[PDB]
């Protein structure tokens, strides 16, 4: 199939984009397919059908590491979260 446009936002509790968070995107086997630090913008991804997980390795000071987020992209481009 084709790649589905995923938009990822790391934010504070006030809903503002938060920079300084070291992030990983992993595939269904746990392999890190993307690595980055948040910079205050929405981060774009394009994923083929499969199961993935956003994982935070380090939070900026004054903040707690969020629970990892597992989601699936199906053949019709629909995205289902936990």
């Amino acid at each position: 199939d084709s790649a589905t446009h995923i938009k990822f936002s790391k934010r504070d509790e006030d809903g503002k984009e938060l920079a300084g968070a070291t992030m990983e995107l992993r595939d269904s086997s746990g392999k890190t397919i993307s690595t980055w630090i948040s910079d205050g913008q929405v981060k774009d991804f394009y994923l083929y059908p499969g199961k993935y997980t956003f994982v935070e390795t380090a939070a900026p000071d004054g903040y707690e590491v969020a629970t990892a987020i597992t989601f699936t992209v199906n053949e019709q481009g629909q995205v289902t979260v936990n």
Partner: peptide, 12 residues
């Protein structure tokens, strides 16, 4: 499709 992850504030 959007995915939103929130960094919670550390305890006060």
């Amino acid at each position: 499709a959007h995915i939103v992850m929130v960094d919670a504030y550390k305890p006060t």
